[PDB]
Design a protein around this ligand. Structure first.
Ligand SMILES: [K+]
Ligand SMILES: [K+]
Ligand SMILES: [Mg+2]
Ligand SMILES: [Mg+2]
Ligand SMILES: [Mg+2]
Ligand SMILES: [Mg+2]
Ligand SMILES: [Mg+2]
Ligand SMILES: [Mg+2]
Ligand SMILES: [Mg+2]
Ligand SMILES: [Mg+2]
Ligand SMILES: [Mg+2]
Ligand SMILES: [Mg+2]
Ligand SMILES: [Mg+2]
Ligand SMILES: [Mg+2]
Ligand SMILES: [Mg+2]
Ligand SMILES: [Mg+2]
Ligand SMILES: [Mg+2]
Ligand SMILES: [Mg+2]
Ligand SMILES: [Mg+2]
Ligand SMILES: [Mg+2]
Ligand SMILES: [Mg+2]
Ligand SMILES: [Mg+2]
Ligand SMILES: [Mg+2]
Ligand SMILES: [Mg+2]
Ligand SMILES: [Mg+2]
Ligand SMILES: [Mg+2]
Ligand SMILES: [Mg+2]
Ligand SMILES: [Mg+2]
Ligand SMILES: [Mg+2]
Ligand SMILES: [Mg+2]
Ligand SMILES: [Mg+2]
Ligand SMILES: [Mg+2]
Ligand SMILES: [Mg+2]
Ligand SMILES: [Mg+2]
Ligand SMILES: [Mg+2]
Ligand SMILES: [Mg+2]
Ligand SMILES: [Mg+2]
Ligand code: NA
Ligand code: NA
Lengths: 126, 49, 68, 197, 96, 229, 145, 144
RNA sequence: UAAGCCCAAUUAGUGAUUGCCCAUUAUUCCUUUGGUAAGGGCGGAAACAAAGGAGAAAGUGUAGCCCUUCCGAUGUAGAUGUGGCCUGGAGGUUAGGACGAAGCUUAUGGCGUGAGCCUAAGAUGGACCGGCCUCUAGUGCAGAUCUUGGUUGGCGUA
RNA sequence: UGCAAGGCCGGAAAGAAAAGAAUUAGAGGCACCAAGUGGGCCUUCUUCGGUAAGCGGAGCAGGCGAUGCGGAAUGAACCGC
RNA sequence: UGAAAUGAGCGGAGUAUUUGAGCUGCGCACGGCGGCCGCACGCACUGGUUUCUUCUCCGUGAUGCUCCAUGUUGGCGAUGGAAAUGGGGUGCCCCCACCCGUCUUGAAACACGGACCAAGGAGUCAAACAGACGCGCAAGGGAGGAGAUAUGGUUGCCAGUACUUCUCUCGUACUGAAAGGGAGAUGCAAAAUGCAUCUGUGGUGUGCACACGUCAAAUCCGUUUGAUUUGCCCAACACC
RNA sequence: AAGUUUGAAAAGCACUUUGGAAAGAGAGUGAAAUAGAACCUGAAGUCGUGACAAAGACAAUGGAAGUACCUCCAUUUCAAC
């Protein structure tokens, strides 16, 4: 099935907002933390420092949440979940949960091919 | 600078640009200059008398 | 140690941030408490008469509206 | 770069939804939001705004107050005209101090059992706000009423009781405590009862 | 610096009027890579297969008074390894 | 088929379309007539002044020009480090941002108001072309509190609800001649928001007389604004 | 008794048919023509409802709730089966006879059912063609009763 | 519930709303009601006038039972008269008899206008209450 | 024959009044977010099988009902809000797992402004466990000469 | 019958003319509950003590503190924003 | 790339319309001399002349509530160990860029704590009060402690749930140090406990809605949306 | 301080070969032996090794924008497209 064509997807920023000086200490995760140091140069917004997330980086609402294939991901755990996406098959694609086994995955993939429902991680074929 | 908007706001702008084209006309401008100079000079000379 | 003694440096800005509020108008909070007593007593008697008159006029207006 | 100094002081706290979890309040809010948007009458707008309000701001009203204001309206009302519907956006509570009342049509969010019994016994009718919407969608010939909040103990406790001109109750569990020093002239001073303002 | 605009000095262009004459002309930066990558007419003209690559841009406006020009390249900016290197300023698109 | 209320809406909408087209035509004709009248009035006034000056010069006399009634004022400084009196005056002038521009009446109250904020605002006496250019290109109206660009005369008529002001030329006339509805017209408009003067300024920190920018520069404000507009 | 508005207020946030996976609010309600979690599409909740269903043989079944037997769950929904080749406009009119605000979605769903039947037949034929060349060491057959 | 407190919101704020300068210290003003006359005088004076000092005679062994004397007004007597009793009540006829002490009241007060005339049995009564209840056609009967 | 100082100018007694460069400023365009926000639509118009489509919720807040239109967005201490993220348990409700559950690993991609979420692959593991509504708390770490355990350059050195 | 004070009944109201004859990104009032803070520093102008001080102390007002960005090569505060 | 083209621009139809510039009529205005003489060509006749200049009229609602879907010419893509685009890595170039946390007016500081990693690590619980918000009832509200019995049963679910208090508590009434006193309105009146009635805001000013009209504007002509008069004024505020 | 928590079951590695032994190399049991004995999983940190990227001295790290090279990855196309 073909996804519905949308406006061209424009990302205001591709790089992640990573925690300040996380590369220098192995224990620090790259997950963003708001710098609250009084003398922090990231918090004070010096020119040569990395940026902080704010509302201005938010993505265009028309193309928000859309995967590169053009669809939007909907988690799917069994065969019966495919019928929720039957009518909106050009807008949503099914994402089989990681913990669904290979057996039930065979069932899901067969049904999804029969229904013309896109599977984001349904391997091979078509 | 947009003709649509300028004419929409001022429906009379066609006549104004027509008059401007008339004033820019070389023969019209030269005739008007000669006539204006003669007329004003005559009026001033009669006034001082 | 020694510190700064006194300043009025930021005080006008703070006073004007929520602004200097204008006075309560003359028609509000016009209490006569503490004014010259004889005039207040005479005005009290006049006001009691006026309340009686207001009740009488209201009764007459109700009577006239009913009769009409 | 625009000099907007104190522009946030202009903003006021406006609420457009209810904190109430009562689903029937939600239904009434839906109905009167639609009515206030689609009907020109200011009665519907006031009713919607009051339905949004909190419980403390939808104060209860006694039945005797309704009777008194409806009588005050009844005089100077043409005898041909029918009496207005009393509309309260809070609770209506009975009043044991007024045994005899006329037959009044009252619309309220809630009636106490005694108040409903009194209204029905007097010959009147207790109306529901959707019944009011059906019989008076615009609000024509209605008496919109509010309860009194100035007599609540919270209001009686507001302000400092020690400044002159103040007659607010203190926060004191013991009544005999806090009665001597700033309260009697003999205990070196008394807080002045009056202050010119 | 702002790398989305580049400055190009052209031989015998030493006035703002000349740089104005060049406004809109196509601009090419020619270099070479290390491998032979895909090119225009890779299949049609196998003789064009080379490590030689090119980045294309256009003249947007004159810069200053002495014939310098502002150039913007298609999408990506021109690499700084090109600073001081040859730039091709073609005569097309032609207005004359 | 078509529901009854749908058909009633269809009839009402047909009538509305006919009425709207008729109203557009009538407003166009009225605006045309008013613009013609204003144009003829302006040209006659200028010719009258020219003849008066010539008669004065013919017999050794002088002609005193009428003191200008309108001034056009633009803010040329940012919003940093402003004293409270100047800040209040600029707020009352609606010049809350740099290169905000407004028209004011050149009377004693406003003149003394402008004297106290001179380092912040460059001003002068607008020409007809300046008024027209500002209204047509930079003119915005306060409609339901929103900054709405002037694109048609119907919105002007709806905004002002005055028989004297139904089109853009009525606004230009009221501003330029300081008419009965000058305050109404200027208060109905959003403050003009201009670009920086292409070609640069001279010096924001000095008066125009000293070679700077911030003073009253008389009719020389028109070249400055023409570069700004 | 208890209106649809009240029930929708009661069940909008929490329900067994609401499927909030990721940030998407779908609905596995069997009487929803669309899968959207709205009051209009909640066929299990409205007084009257009509949902387009597939039937064996490429046919289309229309399930209708009328509100006459809403207190008898086994009599609430009556199924009418349209023979294969039925125009989607006929199914749309069958739905609109009960709920005019579901006509467009019912038409689209009937056309979708027809497409699904045809594509299912094609995919089954292709799979059978592929299966005719496999050794298939094991095969399971259900007993008869 | 712990998930609604400011503590959850302040995870990562490093100060929890007490400031970098003043900080959150143990007892910066003393403990409890300390300093009511020194460094807390203004608070006590403007919020709890009369807090300090003595007033009045002492009553060493105070017993609330002898002092029990709850009161009811004339305009609240319908709370003790039943519905059909109230309906059948008028001047000169058979009147309901209200036993105050059985209903939890000792004195009858005269505030307001009595609605339904009745015979009230009370331990105490104000003069205004007695006068009004006789003027309305009821009566007061003393009881112990 | 300044690339110094004091005056002037903008391509020069030629024919008028903008030389040029640089901002998180101005104007304008696009997008986000929040309003003391401003408005419209929401009684499915009619028609339409497979071999133009889909949606349309009377709504604070979500993947925001949908659309249009204006205005503002920095900020220590501090306040507040968030159908805001995350953790261990409890009522419910839906699922998943020996065709591999939790844990663990990543040039492993996708989504989200973010807290994070999800998928993929393990040539990892071998038995539990996910989503959503609500309830609950011993619920989130980079530093406290922090606690415990392990490691570590100095160092094959003294 | 004058004056003073509360009212009641009527009148007239450029709704405030003309003389430069205001303007406003002008919703006015009224509360309730609370937080941080209560070491400040710099500057134009005015100012006191001191030979003076990057010294001590004040007034009006702007800043920094809490704030970056573009300039003064460099600088919390100067210029611009 | 015409999925609504609003166009002086796209259609249709006319050779005209009327802008200005020249020349010029009457009266007024303006200037000079003090009624004339001048009027540079001002205003009214929306004056005359067309000598030059000029485009002049009409025209399509949404029966589309919303979103998305439409050209030309080449190159590269023909299932490929493909092409392309976007992500990731690593290096390089130009430019930019003081070390985090902290106290402090002021930190990159020659101020202090800072080798690494894992696990742990700090606004909690109770009670009194108050305010905001959600609930339930309301002149009343509510327990508590105990009782019975479904349960005198059941390993356990079930230490829960269901039921009842002439009580207790808070409130409906305050005030005085206490002795102990204790609040309606109106009318007539003027009794050191006055009398009569009981459908009633104690009065005044300002005050939602509603009713009565009256205006102005916009109207698809149905109305809506802003006043504003009068009556009642709810809630509140002020003076009595 | 310390879970003897290998495995379903000791079936707890016979035997050959090098080694003085410890052990190694094979073989064997077991579904698994980086399940080989205080042995389930087996993280971070640190270290070894093979392959590759390069790289002066700008301490290193870091931002922004490109490019060279790689990519066990994610999508989209392969023909009247
Ligand atoms: K490791
Ligand atoms: K790179
Ligand atoms: Mg991202
Ligand atoms: Mg600081
Ligand atoms: Mg796994
Ligand atoms: Mg101090
Ligand atoms: Mg009270
Ligand atoms: Mg300059
Ligand atoms: Mg200065
Ligand atoms: Mg239809
Ligand atoms: Mg920290
Ligand atoms: Mg705090
Ligand atoms: Mg403190
Ligand atoms: Mg004593
Ligand atoms: Mg903070
Ligand atoms: Mg726990
Ligand atoms: Mg890595
Ligand atoms: Mg803890
Ligand atoms: Mg840790
Ligand atoms: Mg070592
Ligand atoms: Mg005036
Ligand atoms: Mg201190
Ligand atoms: Mg100092
Ligand atoms: Mg500080
Ligand atoms: Mg410098
Ligand atoms: Mg044409
Ligand atoms: Mg500290
Ligand atoms: Mg110090
Ligand atoms: Mg520091
Ligand atoms: Mg030092
Ligand atoms: Mg220390
Ligand atoms: Mg009990
Ligand atoms: Mg009390
Ligand atoms: Mg231990
Ligand atoms: Mg084996
Ligand atoms: Mg293993
Ligand atoms: Mg192990
Ligand atoms: Na009780
Ligand atoms: Na390695």
């Amino acid at each position: 099935v073909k996804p519905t064509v949308s406006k061209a997807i424009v990302k205001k920023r591709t790089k992640r907002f990573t925690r300040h000086r996380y590369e220098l200490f192995p224990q620090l995760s790259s997950s963003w933390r708001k710098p609250r140091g009084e003398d922090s140069p990231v918090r004070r917004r010096y020119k040569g420092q990395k940026a902080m997330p704010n509302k201005g980086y938010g993505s265009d609402r028309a193309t928000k949440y859309i995967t590169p294939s053009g669809f939007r991901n909907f988690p799917i755990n069994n065969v019966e979940d495919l019928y929720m996406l039957v009518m909106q098959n050009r807008k949503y694609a099914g994402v089989i949960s990681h913990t669904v086994g290979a057996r039930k995955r065979k069932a899901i993939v067969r049904k999804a091919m029969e229904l013309d429902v896109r599977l984001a991680n349904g391997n091979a074929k078509l | 600078k947009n003709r649509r908007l300028r004419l929409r706001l001022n429906p009379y702008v066609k006549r104004e640009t027509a008059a401007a084209k008339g004033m820019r006309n070389v023969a019209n401008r030269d005739a008007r200059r000669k006539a204006k100079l003669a007329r004003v000079t005559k009026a001033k000379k009669a006034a001082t008398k | 140690a020694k510190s700064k003694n006194h300043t009025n440096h930021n005080q006008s800005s703070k006073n004007h941030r929520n602004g200097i509020k204008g006075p309560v108008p003359l028609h509000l909070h016009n209490s006569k408490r503490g004014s010259w007593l004889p005039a207040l007593v005479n005005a009290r008697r006049v006001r009691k008469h006026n309340q009686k008159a207001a009740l009488k006029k209201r009764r007459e207006r109700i009577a006239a509206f009913a009769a009409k | 770069g625009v000099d907007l100094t104190g522009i946030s002081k202009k903003s006021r706290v406006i609420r457009h939804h209810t904190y109430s979890t009562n689903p029937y309040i939600k239904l009434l809010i839906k109905l009167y939001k639609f009515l206030a948007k689609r009907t020109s009458s200011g009665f519907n707008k006031v009713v919607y705004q009051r339905l949004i309000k909190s419980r403390s701001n939808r104060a209860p009203i006694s039945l005797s107050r309704i009777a008194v204001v409806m009588k005050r309206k009844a005089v100077f009302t043409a005898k041909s005209k029918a009496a207005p519907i009393a509309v309260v956006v809070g609770d209506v509570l009975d009043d044991v101090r007024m045994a005899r009342i006329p037959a009044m049509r009252v619309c309220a969010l809630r009636f106490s059992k005694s108040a409903r019994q009194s209204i029905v016994a007097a010959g009147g009718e207790c109306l529901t706000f959707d019944q009011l919407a059906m019989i008076a969608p615009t609000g024509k010939n209605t008496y919109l009423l509010r309860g009194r909040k100035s007599g609540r103990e919270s209001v009686r406790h507001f302000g400092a009781s020690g400044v002159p001109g103040s007659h607010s109750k203190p926060y004191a569990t013991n009544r005999g405590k806090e009665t001597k020093r700033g309260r009697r002239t003999g205990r070196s001073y008394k807080r002045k009862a009056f202050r010119h303002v | 610096q702002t790398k989305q605009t580049a400055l190009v000095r052209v031989e015998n262009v030493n006035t703002r009027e000349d740089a104005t004459w060049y406004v809109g002309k196509r601009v090419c930066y020619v270099y070479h890579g290390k491998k032979v990558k895909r090119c225009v007419r890779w299949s049609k003209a196998p003789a064009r297969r080379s490590t030689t690559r090119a980045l294309w841009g256009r003249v947007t406006r004159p810069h200053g008074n002495a014939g310098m020009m502002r150039v913007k390249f298609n999408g990506a900016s021109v690499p700084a390894s090109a600073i001081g290197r040859r730039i091709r300023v073609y005569l097309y698109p032609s207005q004359i | 088929k078509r529901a009854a209320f749908k058909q009633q809406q269809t009839e009402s909408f047909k009538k509305a379309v006919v009425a709207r087209k008729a109203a557009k035509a009538a407003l166009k004709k009225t605006a045309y007539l008013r613009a013609r009248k204003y144009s003829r009035e302006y040209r006659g006034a200028e010719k009258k002044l020219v003849t008066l000056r010539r008669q004065a010069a013919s017999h050794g006399n002088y002609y005193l020009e009428a003191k200008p009634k309108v001034a056009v004022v633009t803010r040329i400084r940012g919003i940093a480090k402003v004293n409270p009196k100047q800040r209040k005056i600029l707020q009352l002038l609606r010049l809350r941002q740099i290169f905000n521009t407004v028209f004011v009446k050149m009377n004693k109250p406003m003149e003394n108001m402008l004297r106290a904020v001179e380092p912040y605002i460059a001003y002068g006496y607008p020409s007809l072309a300046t008024v027209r250019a500002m209204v047509y290109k930079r003119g915005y109206l306060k409609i339901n509190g929103q900054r709405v660009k002037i694109t048609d005369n119907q919105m002007i008529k709806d905004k002002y609800n005055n028989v004297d002001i139904v089109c853009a030329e009525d606004m230009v006339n009221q501003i330029y001649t300081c008419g009965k509805h000058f305050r109404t017209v200027t208060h109905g408009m959003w403050p003009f928001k201009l670009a920086p003067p292409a070609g640069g300024m001279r010096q924001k920190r000095r008066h125009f007389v000293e070679g700077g920018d911030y003073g009253n520069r008389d009719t020389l404000i028109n070249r400055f604004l023409a570069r700004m507009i | 008794s208890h209106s649809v508005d009240l029930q929708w207020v009661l069940v909008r946030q929490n329900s067994r048919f609401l499927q909030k996976r990721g940030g998407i609010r779908m609905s596995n309600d069997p009487f929803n023509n669309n899968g959207n979690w709205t009051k209009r599409h909640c066929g299990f909740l409205n007084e009257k409802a009509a949902v387009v269903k597939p039937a064996k043989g490429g046919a289309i079944c229309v399930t209708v709730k009328d509100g006459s037997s809403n207190n008898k769950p086994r009599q609430t929904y009556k199924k009418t089966v349209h023979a294969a080749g039925v125009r989607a406009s006929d199914v749309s009119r069958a739905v609109a006879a009960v709920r005019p605000d579901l006509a467009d979605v019912s038409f689209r769903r009937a056309r979708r059912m027809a497409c699904i039947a045809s594509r299912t037949a094609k995919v089954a034929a292709a799979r059978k063609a592929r299966s005719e060349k496999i050794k298939f060491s094991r095969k399971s057959a259900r007993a008869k009763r | 519930p712990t998930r609604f407190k400011k503590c959850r919101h302040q995870r990562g704020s490093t100060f929890c709303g007490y400031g970098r300068v003043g900080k959150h210290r143990k007892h910066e003003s003393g403990r409890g009601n300390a300093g009511g006359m020194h460094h807390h005088r203004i608070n006590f004076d403007k919020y709890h006038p009369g807090y300090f000092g003595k007033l009045g005679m002492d009553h060493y062994h105070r017993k609330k039972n002898p002092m029990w004397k709850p009161t009811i007004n004339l305009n609240n007597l319908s709370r003790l008269i039943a519905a059909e009793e109230a309906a059948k009540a008028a001047k000169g006829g058979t009147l309901p008899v209200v036993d105050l002490q059985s209903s939890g009241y000792a004195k009858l007060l005269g505030n307001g206008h009595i609605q339904v005339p009745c015979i009230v049995k009370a331990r105490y009564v104000s003069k205004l209450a007695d006068k009004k209840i006789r003027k309305a056609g009821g009566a007061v009967v003393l009881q112990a």
